[PDB]
Write an enzyme that holds these catalytic residues in place. Structure first.
Site, PDB file in Angstrom:
ATOM      1  N   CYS E  31      17.478  51.821 -10.890  1.00  0.00           N
ATOM      2  CA  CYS E  31      17.772  51.117 -12.127  1.00  0.00           C
ATOM      3  C   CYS E  31      17.192  49.710 -12.084  1.00  0.00           C
ATOM      4  O   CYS E  31      17.405  48.971 -11.117  1.00  0.00           O
ATOM      5  CB  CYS E  31      19.285  51.078 -12.333  1.00  0.00           C
ATOM      6  SG  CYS E  31      19.895  49.941 -13.565  1.00  0.00           S
ATOM      7  N   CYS E  34      19.871  46.834 -13.338  1.00  0.00           N
ATOM      8  CA  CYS E  34      20.884  46.689 -12.300  1.00  0.00           C
ATOM      9  C   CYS E  34      20.537  45.587 -11.304  1.00  0.00           C
ATOM     10  O   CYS E  34      21.441  44.950 -10.757  1.00  0.00           O
ATOM     11  CB  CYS E  34      21.085  48.021 -11.589  1.00  0.00           C
ATOM     12  SG  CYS E  34      21.624  49.322 -12.707  1.00  0.00           S
TER      13      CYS E  34
END
Lengths: 132, 110, 65, 47, 108, 45, 278, 5, 338, 232, 210
Positions: E31, E34
């Site tokens: 991700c 993230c």
């Protein structure tokens, strides 16, 4: 080549002065006949003039009959044909570049003819001038 | 050179010694053949206010520039030299100006 | 760029080119006497005179264009 | 030999930056020495 | 600062006693945002270290806890209260750090 | 203002054109017109 | 694919001169030249290269004088260093050494490079040593584009594409007038022709993408995320109790009916500040 | 010129 | 008025990525990828389907389309920040029912897993659908994220049926949320109700494999472009799902390859995916948003060619291009970590 | 004047400090030198004529080709600067006084460029191999077709000369006229065509011309317009 | 960092939109390459829409214009559309009265740029439908009279380069000027040209399956 006929076997100075006045007409007529030969033959048969290493049949019918098995469309066949073109052949072909528009006749005059532009080998031999 | 190198543009039979060449800022060819070569090029080795300039400036009537160029850029001190050398020849170059108001004959500083 | 057309306009206005240029020199030296702000940077007294005079001609030019 | 956009007006000359790259017209002038490159306003001639 | 857990360690951390609000950040190695979140809540950690505490949980292999704590995507983070008199806010998307300050200091 | 030429610019023809421009417009226009025709000439050359 | 490119030929005349010809076919009229000229200019000018930019002979007799026991002058060795070809991908400033301690030929193979640089031709002669001198020289290497202007500066140039060409040929479709582009690239072995073609394409895209970035440099009043400066604006305004600027309020958030919203949006009225138009 | 008078 | 407005329904929260799946990218591992260690690449290539519907609205607005985002932001500072971000991106937010009773990003209660008091974006109601927008919105875009909450499910189904009554094209893009990959039968039980109503659908190749139950019989990170990776699943693999309304299904393996299927035509366009990859862009999400936006753009601006293979080829190519351009922009803006 | 400028900006407290900064050649010195050069003319002297200098890269003085070891001089007094700007500019002196002959006339490359620009069509025998052209509704359509390589600089085209005054002619009667039964007729000439009718009126002249001739006319018309833009 | 701004915009006619755009800062030499490529893209890589054929199935009686003048005024019709392939538009007017671009019945994706554009004047009560073939084409590409309109949404484009800041990096600034025909705004033309250029150069980054 029969594009013109002359009063004798050698072009008079009058005829060469008129050619000087009109050559671009015959040049564009030859270039148009070259475009039309491209349209008729297709790119494989046209450009195979400058790929001596391409031995396969280049006619539109053969290009189709090859597409009907090898799955390679006409474009992939043309890329392969050019992949067999040598650098020197490619440089000669570059006369057909759409910006250059080199005269189809000037591309195909042989040495013993082009020699007559300056009038054959110089009488005093150039080896006297050549230096490494 | 053409047929050995397969550079057919070097000897274009239509106009021998010239070739079509391209604009590096555009890629289009210049529409007439350009003469090309590899010539041998050599690099070479490396304020009076003149009377004809005075004549030109005064022709323009631009006479304050003429005054600047002939005086304070270098009576003027060179006219002082002129009068002093004639005065040394025992000739009095005497400069007067006449008052328009009073007719007084003012002697110039010379 | 454009300022020389104003110059030509004023040259066309005044009846003697040399008298016009004399009047411009006079105006500039009296300007630089009646005002003692330095006024000598990116804008110049000559251009100021030309600007004010073309503004008298009615034309929308700023001081020293 | 072709007329470019005036920068070769009446025998002015254009040069490539490669003439500066290659030291092609770099001279040495001794006084101490200076590696004089070719510059705008330098003079060149053919024979 | 920020501590990788496992689902059982997070379970015992959340059901045990705590002194401070707990932030748990669901992230994955795949991700992008993230990582921005991990920077935001590393600033959070360093500015709150003694007053709020932060852990991270890797939904690439704790995916049963994930699908158990209604995580609809990534990044998502849960502000569990220090005491169960009221319970966890959850927040999804790359929220501004001020929006975390005004939870930890205005929701708690 | 000016007539469309549809004919080749001889040096005498451009001397006529520039003189007629100076006489019609004065210096104001012609000093720009000629300075742009410079750039036109450079472009086409 | 319909539009296809291939490496039609490649040659390696030397470790320091690769050649490659490429084809790109079923281009449309006027695509082939727009590609060819941009690709040419990218290759010739927008490709970057790595080379030695500075040298420091660790013992110098004088700034301009000859060097003992070397069969050629400091200037000849500086030129031989200028002709060194390097293969680096990482930018920045880097250093290297030669420490050759006896008679023989010093060559590019003797350059101790940093980890991020590679010699393109080990065999490139640098200097001839007749005497057993402990010849140590430092080098400083840079990756850049074009050219740039005590240790010697080296007037090196960062241009690994040695030459490029293109030719455009009718494909022969009598209606669509499709075209074939050939590209030719000669490079120092710092890049293969294909790698130079890729990096030229990518650099062109990196030049044109800017016009597709968030428009008119106008998104807030450098930042990675684009909505945090405005969040901080709203936070500071709320802390200051300073209401909100009409510039940031849009007619789209007002109650006004669709038939007026359409006419205003077609009029490019967007912010309530556009209702400065009385 | 300019200095006519 | 022209261009035709597209209405994009769902959430808009910033940089929210719904899931990530093992993926294969069309890349020359030999040469560039082994030769440049200066460019960044992930040790495991996991691709996300896309993003929020607000993200697709912003993308389509950037492509010069007209987009209206339908939802509610809260009246809280982040909700006004999102509303500004949408407006400056030229997205229409006349459909955003900005609501002071809700906080924007914060779903407010979970004990464990609890559903209590969901956030603003989770709680648009059927009375807040701007039906006058859906009159003009010639295409309606929505995603499976709108179906997780049963209130959002009901609102979505109402907006869908309104759009069908008004004659709008329904574009359904799964972006299959993280809670759904754990059960196929649950996923189908949720999505079928809208699937039968969807006129156009976008599914990742992984979402297609999941809904078909076919495990990935292929290599991922093996450094080759073996065409068995990029398999074009035969139409009989997808006829199972072809409800009698679907005009055109797009199956996207990111920007590497976009397949398309219809009742009569099917095929694929081979794109490229050697765009700059960075951290902060590792997930490739914005390429998916750009692809979806390009599909929406082409299909909405020429609705009559929904079943012309030439136009579908052009549309898929346009989507590949838009995706490349978007993940490029993203890489150039978001950047590289210290 | 650089010293005076540094005093004007108060960046030097005395002329020795100003000279010291000038010796230091810091960018401030070049900024103030640009301020000083702005609006100050200089004389160039071979043959003596004045110009506005602009600060230029390099080291060798750059001169305009039509005005072309030149010497350079600064007019020091305000009266001299006024006289220089208003009397001594090339603008003021486009005519050689000996008969009133324009000096600055296009010459060298430009003239032959204009010659080719105005050579235009190949005529007759030079254009067709045997004994036996687009229409453009305005000149910008023709220039667009040229730029898009639909037509070449030398090639003949028809331009709608809707400014149907000012038609050029060679005192030549119509080479042909066609009358339609309905009383429209077309007059064809070696350079232009006119469509006009016994009812109604003249519709349009079409001038047979080239992209070169069009560009020659257009760039002069647009130079007049570009100059008179300031008349607004 | 590289950023662009719209420095100026004008609308001096409904069929002449002007814009000028700054991009800065640029590395030595990039500005000219960008300007050249962008100018080629604007001036012929943009797909544009215009009337390509007209059918008038009825010199026609009662029309004031010659048929050739009708066709040449139709050429001046400026259209914006996202058509794929050709499509049919249709004039239908019963005289007397003006026929104008407003009177074009448009195929779905087309919109008129200047509805006030003239077409024909009917001097008497007659039927004049006109069946119009419309196409969208690139500028460089290519009872039934062809109108040969040159697919030219950008009438002109130019660029210039300036050094800035006097900094010894010699980085420079690009100004692009665009005269769009009103079928596109200058900013849309800039975006379209940039995107079409990227679509031309991406092919060199195409990998192919094994």
């Amino acid at each position: 080549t029969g594009q013109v006929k002359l009063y004798g076997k050698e072009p008079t100075l009058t005829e060469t002065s008129l050619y000087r006045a009109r050559r671009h007409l015959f040049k564009e007529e030859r270039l148009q006949a070259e475009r039309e030969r491209l349209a008729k033959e297709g790119p494989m048969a046209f450009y195979s003039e400058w790929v001596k290493a391409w031995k396969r049949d280049t006619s539109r019918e053969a290009v189709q009959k090859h597409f009907e098995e090898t799955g390679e469309d006409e474009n992939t066949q043309l890329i392969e044909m050019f992949s067999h073109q040598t650098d020197r052949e490619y440089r000669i072909m570059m006369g057909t570049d759409v910006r250059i528009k080199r005269d189809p006749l000037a591309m195909r005059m042989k040495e013993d003819q082009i020699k007559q532009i300056w009038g054959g080998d110089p009488v005093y031999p150039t080896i006297n001038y050549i230096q490494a | 050179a053409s047929k050995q190198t397969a550079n057919p543009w070097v000897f274009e039979p239509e106009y021998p010694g010239k070739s079509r060449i391209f604009d590096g800022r555009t890629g289009d060819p210049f529409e007439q053949p350009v003469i090309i070569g590899k010539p041998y090029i050599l690099k070479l080795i490396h304020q009076r206010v003149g009377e004809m300039e005075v004549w030109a400036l005064e022709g323009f009537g631009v006479a304050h520039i003429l005054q600047e160029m002939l005086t304070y850029k270098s009576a003027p001190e060179s006219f002082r030299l002129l009068v002093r050398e004639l005065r040394s020849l025992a000739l009095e170059l005497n400069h007067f100006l006449v008052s328009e108001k009073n007719f007084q004959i003012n002697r110039k500083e010379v | 760029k454009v300022m020389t057309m104003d110059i030509e306009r004023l040259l066309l206005s005044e009846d003697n080119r040399f008298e016009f240029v004399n009047s411009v020199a006079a105006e500039a030296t009296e300007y630089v006497e009646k005002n003692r702000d330095e006024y000598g940077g990116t804008k110049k007294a000559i251009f100021h005179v030309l600007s004010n005079r073309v503004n008298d001609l009615g034309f929308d030019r700023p001081e020293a264009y | 030999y072709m007329p470019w956009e005036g920068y070769n007006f009446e025998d002015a000359v254009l040069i490539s930056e490669c003439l500066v790259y290659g030291d092609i017209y770099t001279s040495f002038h001794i006084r101490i020495s200076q590696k004089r490159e070719i510059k705008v306003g330098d003079k060149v001639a053919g024979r | 600062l920020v501590r990788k857990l496992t689902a059982e360690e997070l379970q015992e951390l959340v059901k045990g006693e705590r002194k401070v609000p707990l932030i748990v950040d669901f992230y994955a190695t795949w991700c992008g945002p993230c990582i921005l979140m991990a920077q935001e809540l590393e600033m959070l950690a360093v500015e709150y270290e003694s007053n709020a505490m932060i852990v991270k949980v890797d939904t690439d292999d704790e995916y049963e806890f994930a699908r158990d704590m209604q995580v609809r995507g990534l990044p998502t983070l849960f502000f569990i209260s220090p005491d169960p008199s009221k319970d966890a806010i959850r927040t999804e998307g790359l929220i501004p750090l001020q929006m975390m300050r005004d939870i930890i200091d205005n929701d708690m | 203002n000016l007539v469309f030429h549809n004919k080749v610019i001889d040096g005498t023809a451009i001397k006529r054109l520039i003189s007629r421009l100076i006489d019609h417009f004065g210096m104001a226009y012609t000093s720009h017109i000629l300075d742009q025709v410079k750039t036109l000439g450079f472009q086409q050359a | 694919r319909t539009l296809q490119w291939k490496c039609v030929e490649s040659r390696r005349d030397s470790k320091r001169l690769y050649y490659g010809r490429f084809i790109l076919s079923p281009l449309m009229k006027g695509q082939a030249d727009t590609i060819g000229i941009a690709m040419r200019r990218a290759l010739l000018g927008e490709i970057e290269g790595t080379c030695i930019t500075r040298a420091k002979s660790e013992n110098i007799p004088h700034d301009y004088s000859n060097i003992v026991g070397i069969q050629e002058s400091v200037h000849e060795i500086l030129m031989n260093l200028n002709e060194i070809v390097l293969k680096s991908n990482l930018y920045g400033t880097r250093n290297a050494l030669i420490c050759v301690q006896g008679p023989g030929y010093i060559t590019a193979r003797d350059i101790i490079l940093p980890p991020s640089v590679e010699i393109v031709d080990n065999t490139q002669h640098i200097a001839t040593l007749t005497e057993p001198i402990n010849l140590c020289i430092g080098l400083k290497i840079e990756r850049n584009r074009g050219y740039s202007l005590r240790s010697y500066p080296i007037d090196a140039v960062f241009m690994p594409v040695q030459n490029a060409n293109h030719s455009i040929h009718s494909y022969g479709n009598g209606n669509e007038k499709q075209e074939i582009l050939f590209i030719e690239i000669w490079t120092n072995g710092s890049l293969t022709p294909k790698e130079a073609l890729h990096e030229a394409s990518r650099n062109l895209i990196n030049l044109f993408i800017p016009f597709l970035h968030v428009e008119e440099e106008t998104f807030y009043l450098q930042v990675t995320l684009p909505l945090f400066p405005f969040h901080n604006k709203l936070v500071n305004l709320r802390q200051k109790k300073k209401e909100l600027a009409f510039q940031y309020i849009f007619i789209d958030q007002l109650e006004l009916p669709p038939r007026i919203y359409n006419c205003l949006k077609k009029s490019n009225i967007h912010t309530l500040l556009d209702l400065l138009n009385n | 010129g300019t200095g006519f008078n | 008025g022209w261009p035709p407005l597209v209405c994009c329904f769902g959430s808009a929260q910033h940089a929210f990525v719904p899931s990530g799946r093992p993926a294969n990218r069309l890349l020359d591992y030999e040469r560039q990828e082994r030769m440049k260690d200066a460019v960044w690449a992930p040790e495991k290539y996991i691709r996300a389907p896309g993003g929020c519907a607000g993200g697709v609205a912003i993308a389509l607005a950037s492509l010069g389309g007209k987009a209206a985002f339908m939802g509610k932001l809260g009246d809280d500072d982040f909700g006004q920040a999102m509303l500004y971000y949408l407006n400056v991106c030229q997205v229409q937010t006349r459909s955003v029912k900005i609501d002071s009773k809700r906080v924007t990003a914060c779903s407010t209660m979970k004990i464990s897993s609890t559903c209590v008091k969901p956030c603003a974006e989770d709680s648009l109601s059927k009375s807040e659908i701007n039906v006058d927008v859906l009159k003009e919105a010639k295409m309606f875009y929505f995603t499976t994220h709108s179906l997780l909450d049963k209130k959002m499910m009901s609102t979505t189904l109402q907006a869908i049926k309104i759009s069908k009554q008004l004659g709008n094209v329904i574009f359904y893009d799964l972006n299959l949320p993280l809670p759904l990959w754990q059960s196929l039968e649950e996923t189908k039980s949720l999505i079928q109700e809208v699937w039968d109503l969807a006129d156009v659908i976008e599914v990742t190749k992984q979402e297609l494999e999941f809904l078909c139950g076919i495990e990935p019989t292929e290599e991922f990170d093996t450094k080759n472009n073996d065409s068995s990776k990029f398999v074009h699943y035969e139409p009989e693999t997808v006829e199972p799902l072809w409800h009698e309304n679907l005009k055109i299904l797009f199956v996207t393996n990111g920007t590497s390859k976009i397949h398309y299927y219809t009742k009569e035509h099917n095929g694929a366009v081979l794109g490229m995916e050697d765009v700059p990859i960075t951290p902060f862009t590792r997930d490739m999400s914005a390429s998916g948003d750009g692809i979806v936006a390009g599909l929406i753009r082409m299909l909405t601006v020429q609705p009559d060619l929904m079943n012309d293979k030439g136009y579908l080829e052009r549309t898929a190519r346009y989507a590949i291009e838009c995706g490349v351009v978007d993940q490029w922009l993203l890489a150039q803006t978001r950047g590289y970590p210290p | 004047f650089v010293i005076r400028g540094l005093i004007r900006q108060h960046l030097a407290s005395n002329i020795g400090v100003a000279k010291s900064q000038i010796r230091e050649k810091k960018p401030i010195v070049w900024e103030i030198l640009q301020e000083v050069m702005q609006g100050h003319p200089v004389l160039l002297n071979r043959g003596i004529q004045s110009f506005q200098p602009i600060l230029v890269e390099g080291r060798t003085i750059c001169l305009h080709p039509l005005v072309c070891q030149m010497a350079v001089h600064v007019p020091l007094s305000l009266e001299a600067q006024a006289e220089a700007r208003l009397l001594m500019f090339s603008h003021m002196n486009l005519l050689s006084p000996a008969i009133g002959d324009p000096i600055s006339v296009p010459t060298q490359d430009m003239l032959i460029g204009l010659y080719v620009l105005t050579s235009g069509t190949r005529r007759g025998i030079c254009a067709n191999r045997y004994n036996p052209e687009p229409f453009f509704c305005n000149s910008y359509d023709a220039i667009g077709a040229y730029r898009q390589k639909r037509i070449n600089l030398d090639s003949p085209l028809w331009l709608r000369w809707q400014l149907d005054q000012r038609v050029i002619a060679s005192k030549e009667v119509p080479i042909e006229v066609h009358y339609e039964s309905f009383g429209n007729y077309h007059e064809i000439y070696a350079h232009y065509l006119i469509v006009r009718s016994v009812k109604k009126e003249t519709l349009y002249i079409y001038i047979r011309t080239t992209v070169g001739h069009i560009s020659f006319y257009r760039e002069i018309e647009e130079a007049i317009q570009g100059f008179s833009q300031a008349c607004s």
